[PDB]
């Protein structure tokens, strides 16, 4: 038979030229006799080019290749939550089979103009710097960009952990299901990350798709789309999903490899001509659906690694032109101890200021103004400006794996920009903050609760905050 079965003419360069399959469709998942799977990429007048999703070593010439009749898809559903799957949706955590009952095509298209609606709901990252100056809303694509070892994966992990305070509540309109796609990272890194999430008890609502560095380049090229489909499932059912592609530079590298072994004309930095469409067709699927489609959304946090802080490279500028903002993680800031090393001068969120809560906006518009002044100065008043700015940057520094609720953050920024720290020693601010937090978590649960429920800061709550911070400040060093 030469219509539902083929013979491998020549395997090499990660491509299998297969003879037969007169009934195969473009982008159809064929199955090699070795147990492997592949995608029917090229359909030529005599042979079929098949991308192999694995090691070419497992394939010889003459091996029979069956067809599955289904375009490349992944298993989706709630059954994936708490599972570590690979780019093909296969459990690699040894916890049995994925009990999914529906599948979704990885190569779908993004929703058009009408099914969308402007971003309106907050996506609390739990990080003071992000939530205050770079607000991210559900349905946005915010780019985490920066050099190697600057704190990108840590930001993503803090976000996924922070979502825990919502995913245990009642209203299904605030819960957020997270997905972390790993593209070419060391596998030990992903194992340790999965453990870190298991300890914080954030696996019960997270999926981890891992196409690590030892996986074939087609797996690293497909993994983002498996993740985005697992997220589109939640998006199309009125639910909310966050997804982190960590990172897109390594998927771009894998695609460049796949393109050069196919002998396609390399462009700038030897990248293929369509290295932009590669990421655009993927980051466009993170959308906010209107109510006539479910109200669901999908938030994407693509990570990008720059070389020597160079942001005007090829792939960084591509993703900057695709996403709705960025978060610059400088390395000189990371060296001086500032962590998270967010360059709040260059970081931006175009569609986030409409996603802040009222209270966070009340304190953060201010804080942004004073930080802008402090940055543009670096007299008698400018000394005050510099001092307030130094205090505020010292307030933005944060620990790790400890994201703060929105009410705690607005309380801290309130205590900061209301002048109440303009006399303390900068190097002590941090500790003050810590101590302060404990106090407010002990003796002011009702104030935090009403700031939360109201989502705003009323004048009664403002006066309570002022009196509370002054009482604590007087009883301090």
């Amino acid at each position: 038979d030469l219509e539902e079965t083929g013979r491998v003419l020549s395997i090499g360069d990660g491509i299998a030229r297969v003879h037969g399959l007169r009934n195969v469709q473009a982008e159809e998942m064929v199955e090699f006799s070795s147990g492997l799977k592949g995608m029917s990429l090229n359909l030529e007048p005599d042979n079929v080019g098949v991308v192999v999703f694995g090691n070419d070593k497992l394939i010889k010439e003459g091996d029979i290749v069956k067809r599955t009749g289904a375009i490349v898809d992944v298993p989706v559903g709630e059954e994936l939550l708490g599972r570590v799957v690979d780019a093909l949706g296969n459990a690699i955590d040894g916890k049995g089979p994925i009990g999914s009952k529906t599948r979704r095509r990885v190569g779908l298209k993004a929703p058009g103009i009408i099914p969308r609606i402007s971003v309106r709901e907050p996506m609390q990252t739990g990080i003071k710097a992000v939530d205050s100056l770079v607000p991210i809303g559900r349905g946005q694509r915010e780019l985490i960009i920066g050099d190697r070892q600057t704190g990108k994966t840590s930001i993503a992990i803090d976000t996924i952990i922070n979502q825990k305070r919502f995913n245990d509540g009642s209203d299904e309109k605030k819960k957020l299901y997270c997905i972390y796609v790993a593209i070419g990272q060391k596998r030990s890194t992903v194992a340790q990350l999965v453990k870190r999430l298991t300890d914080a008890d954030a696996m019960k609502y997270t999926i981890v798709v891992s196409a690590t560095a030892s996986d074939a380049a087609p797996l690293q090229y497909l993994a983002p789309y498996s993740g985005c489909s697992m997220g589109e499932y939640f998006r199309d059912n009125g639910k909310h999903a966050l997804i982190i592609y960590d990172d897109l530079s390594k998927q771009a590298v894998a695609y460049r490899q796949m393109s050069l072994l196919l002998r396609r004309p390399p462009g700038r930095e030897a990248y293929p001509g369509d290295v932009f469409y590669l990421h655009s067709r993927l980051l466009e699927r993170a959308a906010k659906m209107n109510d006539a489609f479910g109200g669901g959304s999908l938030t994407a946090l693509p990570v990008i690694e720059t070389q020597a802080g160079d942001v005007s490279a090829y792939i960084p500028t591509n993703v900057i032109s695709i996403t709705d903002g960025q978060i610059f993680l400088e390395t000189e800031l990371f060296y001086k101890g500032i962590r998270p090393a967010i360059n709040v001068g260059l970081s931006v969120s175009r569609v986030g200021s409409a996603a802040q809560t009222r209270a966070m906006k009340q304190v953060a518009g201010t804080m942004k103004l004073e930080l802008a002044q402090y940055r543009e100065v670096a007299d008698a008043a400018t000394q005050q400006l510099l001092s307030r700015g130094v205090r505020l940057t010292e307030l933005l520094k944060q620990g790790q794996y400890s994201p703060m609720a929105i009410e705690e953050q607005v309380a801290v920024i309130y205590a900061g920009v209301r002048g109440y720290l303009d006399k303390l020693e900068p190097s002590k601010i941090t500790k003050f903050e810590n101590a302060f937090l404990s106090h407010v978590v002990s003796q002011h649960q009702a104030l935090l609760g009403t700031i939360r429920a109201d989502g705003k800061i009323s004048e009664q709550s403002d006066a309570k905050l002022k009196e509370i911070v002054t009482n604590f400040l007087a009883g301090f060093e």
Binding site: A26, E27, E44, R116, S118, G273, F276, E284, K288
Partner: protein
Amino acid sequence: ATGRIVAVIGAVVDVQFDEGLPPILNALEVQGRETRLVLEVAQHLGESTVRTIAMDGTEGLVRGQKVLDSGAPIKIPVGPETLGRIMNVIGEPIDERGPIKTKQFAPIHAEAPEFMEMSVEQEILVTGIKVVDLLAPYAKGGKIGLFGGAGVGKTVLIMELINNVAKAHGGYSVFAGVGERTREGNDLYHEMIESGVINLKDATSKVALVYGQMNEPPGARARVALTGLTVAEYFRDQEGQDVLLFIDNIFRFTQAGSEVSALLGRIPSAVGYQPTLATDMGTMQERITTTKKGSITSVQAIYVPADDLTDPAPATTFAHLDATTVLSRAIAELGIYPAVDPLDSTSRIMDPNIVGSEHYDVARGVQKILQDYKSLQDIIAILGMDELSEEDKLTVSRARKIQRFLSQPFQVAEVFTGHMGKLVPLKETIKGFQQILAGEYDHLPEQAFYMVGPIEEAVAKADKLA
């Protein structure tokens, strides 16, 4: 004529017709699809086989699938019944409001206007932006191109020009979204709905929208620019109106040509683009022009890959534009906005016989002082500021003041900035720069000019500085 599919390479389909080989640029339909799939003929490979660019996704195609010739290029509905709608590249309405009940259809491929039809009128177009109007003023009917890397402010600038020009406009207006963010299209649709320009309940809409965005395969991104051109061409020729045409982004047309050209079996030219880059851009950009039968004022955003302003695509586009505004990242990172580069933007009407000797002298003085400051940059950076001549310190201070003043807050940028958008008339700009050149404000701090309106607000702020 009925052919069959013999090769499927990504977005390029080779189909073998038995008899009745369709000419080049014809549209073919693929039989057996849930949604319409149009293939445009690009080559004749011999053996009665033709190569085609698909206009949508090509997954699920199987070798041997039937294909029907339509016998004509991709025809889109044109007319006043297209205003307030949203059509994709092949002309289907994608706004979910029913079909476009217009009378006639036009083909998206057409010949450029001849030489005798070209008009040479060069009235100025006051946008209200200080740097644009001072250094690179636009012209009615001219072609405007906003260059700039990723994240420097092209889209905000186009939204500002839509707010300042497409609202006080008399004729019609077209917006062609060629490979850009879809959420930007949704936001533009709703912002135009609320502002009364698009009227969904009656037939008084003043804008037609075409959209093939960055989620579309390269065929759609390559031809949606031509679709928008076709709509604007109808509104110009067949009604003699005064049309505006906002294209964003036009670099994606060339980039899509490059994405498909590898598979069309062609030797890559320099960088990696198609060998036919310049002529493709020419046959597209020559249709976008004001004839003597109408007028098309065009504003085209132009991406710049890796900020390389010598990349073949923008370096080829430069020759097609009447006025260029080159946003720069080195300036946006100074906090200045808009990030226009005052030393790289040019215009064909910056001529003393057009904008008046006064405007010309002011513009040239601003450019000269900024160029002198740019020359001093390295000395100032290494050998300190207080090692300069007194005249040199004067020029440095004045040039920094002018740098700040050239910035201006936008009405559409008040969502993530808070400041109030200003609209500086031409006279106020000329006067303010006359005064700053003359040193009439060497006592205020330069910080007073950052992000203000006219010079009155500058001195008002400078007083508020104390």
